[PDB]
Design a protein around this ligand. Structure first.
Ligand code: HEM
Ligand code: HEM
Ligand code: HEM
Ligand code: HEM
Lengths: 146, 283, 146
């Protein structure tokens, strides 16, 4: 994946301040609230009836942490996203049966959560760098689908 | 919106399909699974090999539903009400996929109906299948509930006099993050702080303020803007989802307290309704 | 652009049976009829007021042949679409201001036209190969946008 020096600096600088646990649970929870059809993969997570229940659901919180932790490791290898996420790509296609469009929805929700958390610091140029990054990761996670 | 000419063309084409509806329906599914393999993620429980009973049965079910749609084209939401519930609450297929099946149904009819598949009938069929898809996905989230309307008016009230300011930021965010949207503004200075972007943002924010105030009668309140986008500016509808996301990011960055998960959900629904109205007269 | 040897052959075999001028005028005209917002670039072509007028427009037809001629040339370079179309990409972004979504709509319309033209010979696997190619061409034309 390629970025300008300006972009890569902005992404890594902000990420150093992200608490992956708190942001991960927020992002997954908002995904399930805002786009409720995504709930179809988490039927075992408990009741997902209302935003109140979703956001405080302990399994949602934990899964969120796992997902963004893996996301975080991806940011260490921005120049080789496809090779970094290959195994997880296969897992998501062959074992979990997840439509890759969901990766794009989560990417956009994640950008919303970063804006919500960091406010004015999440400037238009910083957003633009994260938009490239979340699309690069979604494309890497979809790469081994067949 | 489907005109009676549109309805006339679909009835003619589907009538010619006739008892082949099932076979063609099966063929359309087979074509989609091969051309768009991500759609197979919704059928892990099927034997997807060529000629399989499951695929043929899916084809036939889909064909009969389309036949019911054709036969009740002036009452589509009520005709397909059970199927809309089932896709919304059980199957939970991502709406992007409906476009892909629609495309493969059009390819199938084209290959089988050389005489009937004229440019106007093609156009009418494309509209018909998009209408069906809209009706099948309309309960995923639904209309704006009273809770939704309350949330939107609460968040937009808090925006208040900053409406213009945030509008401009939304556009700035969009041009930077999604460079293809810049193609609709070759006559603007798009640099940061540009008065042309500022004026665009305030106009759009003013329109949104109007829609919020007319949240129960948006199509009339937005009517002239719907006309303008459809017949003059002619912005591809994909672009409205991009601005909507950038508006959401802008609100999130300025409303730490107000931007709860529930308010986020209501705002996203609101902007999608606005986008639907604005593209309603394109065809 | 990665197709298998068999995908490439099936694409090239059918294309040899295409009348580029006739098919090009058909694909551009159905584009303007089915997605009329695309007429925005062609206000100087004359009467587009009806489908018959669009399909019989000699400017539309001539543009159609120009466009599918370029497409035709690219099929000889399926392993280097990005390089092949780079300057055309820059032109469509910097000078023509064409939203690359139009490239995708045109690719889908072209597949319909080929199906109409070749009937049962346009089999599901042959469509599959053409779907990859029209997406590859669209991505290559959109590559230099900034
Ligand atoms: C940036 C995007 C994503 C990354 C990096 C990611 C990563 C992961 C990881 C690391 C696991 C753990 C598997 C294990 O422990 O063996 C996992 C599992 C899973 N993921 Fe993804 N994921 C992403 C997006 C998504 C999305 C958007 C969905 C669905 C809407 C999804 C659904 C699942 C499911 C259902 C599981 C299994 C949980 C269980 O055991 O019940 N993932 N993911
Ligand atoms: C015009 C679009 C569509 C129509 C009219 C339609 C209609 C139907 C109908 C009538 C059924 C069978 C219900 C029954 O068993 O009584 C069904 C089931 C189903 N649909 Fe849809 N469908 C459409 C699009 C899609 C798309 C695009 C996908 C996914 C890519 C999809 C996935 C499914 C699944 C997974 C089932 C259940 C299959 C089974 O387990 O038997 N649908 N659809
Ligand atoms: C929530 C969605 C939108 C709303 C409410 C909206 C509304 C408006 C309004 C109020 C105007 C000015 C009309 C006048 O001058 O009387 C306008 C113009 C315009 N819109 Fe939209 N717009 C939306 C989305 C978009 C999108 C996504 C694009 C393209 C990326 C777009 C492109 C344009 C263009 C090109 C102009 C004309 C600019 C000029 O020449 O001054 N619009 N819009
Ligand atoms: C497979 C996709 C396409 C290819 C290969 C293609 C190719 C070309 C070529 C070779 C030219 C001539 C440039 C020159 O004079 O040096 C051209 C021009 C042009 N194209 Fe594209 N094009 C494609 C799609 C589109 C689409 C979908 C639209 C708009 C709906 C479009 C709009 C235009 C316009 C407005 C011109 C200029 C016409 C003139 O000045 O006479 N193109 N294109």
């Amino acid at each position: 994946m390629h970025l300008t020096p300006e972009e890569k600096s902005a992404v890594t600088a902000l990420w150093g301040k992200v608490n992956v646990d708190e942001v991960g649970g927020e992002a997954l929870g908002r995904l399930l609230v805002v786009y409720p059809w995504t709930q179809r993969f988490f039927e075992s997570f408990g009741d997902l009836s209302t935003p109140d229940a979703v956001m405080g659901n302990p399994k949602v919180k934990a899964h969120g942490k796992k997902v963004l932790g893996a996301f975080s490791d991806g940011l260490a290898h921005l120049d080789n996203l496809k090779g970094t996420f290959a195994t997880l790509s296969e897992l998501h296609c062959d074992k979990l049966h997840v439509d890759p469009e969901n990766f794009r929805l989560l990417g956009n929700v994640l950008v919303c959560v970063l804006a919500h958390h960091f406010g004015k610091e999440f400037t238009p140029p910083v957003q633009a760098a994260y938009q490239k990054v979340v699309a690069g990761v979604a494309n890497a996670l979809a790469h081994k689908y067949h | 919106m489907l005109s009676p000419a549109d309805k006339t063309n679909v009835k003619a084409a589907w009538g010619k399909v006739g008892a082949h509806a099932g076979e063609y329906g099966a063929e359309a599914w087979e074509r989609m699974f091969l051309s768009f393999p991500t759609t197979k993620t919704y059928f892990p429980h099927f034997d997807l090999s060529h000629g399989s009973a499951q695929v043929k049965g899916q084809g036939k079910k889909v064909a009969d539903a389309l036949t019911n749609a054709v036969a009740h084209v002036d009452d589509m939401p009520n005709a397909l009400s059970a199927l809309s519930d089932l896709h919304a609450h059980k199957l939970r297929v991502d709406p992007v996929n409906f476009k892909l099946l629609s495309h493969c149904l059009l390819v199938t009819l084209a290959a089988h109906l050389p005489a009937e598949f004229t440019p106007a009938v093609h156009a009418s069929l494309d509209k018909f299948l998009a209408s069906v898809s809209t009706v099948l996905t309309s309960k995923y989230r639904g209309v704006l509930s009273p809770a939704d309307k309350t949330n939107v008016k609460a968040a937009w009230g808090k925006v208040g006099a900053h409406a213009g300011e945030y509008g401009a930021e939304a556009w700035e965010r969009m041009f930077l993050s999604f460079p293809t949207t810049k193609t609709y503004f070759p006559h603007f200075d798009l640099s940061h702080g540009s008065a042309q972007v500022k004026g665009q943002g305030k106009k759009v924010a003013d329109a949104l303020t109007n829609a919020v105030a007319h949240v129960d009668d948006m199509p009339n309140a937005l009517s002239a803007l719907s006309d303008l986008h459809a017949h003059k500016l002619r912005v591809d509808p994909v672009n409205f989802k991009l601005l909507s996301h950038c508006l959401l990011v802008t609100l999130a960055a300025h409303l730490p307290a107000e931007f709860t998960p529930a308010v986020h959900a209501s705002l996203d629904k609101f902007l999608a309704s606005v986008s639907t109205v604005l593209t309603s007269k394109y065809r």
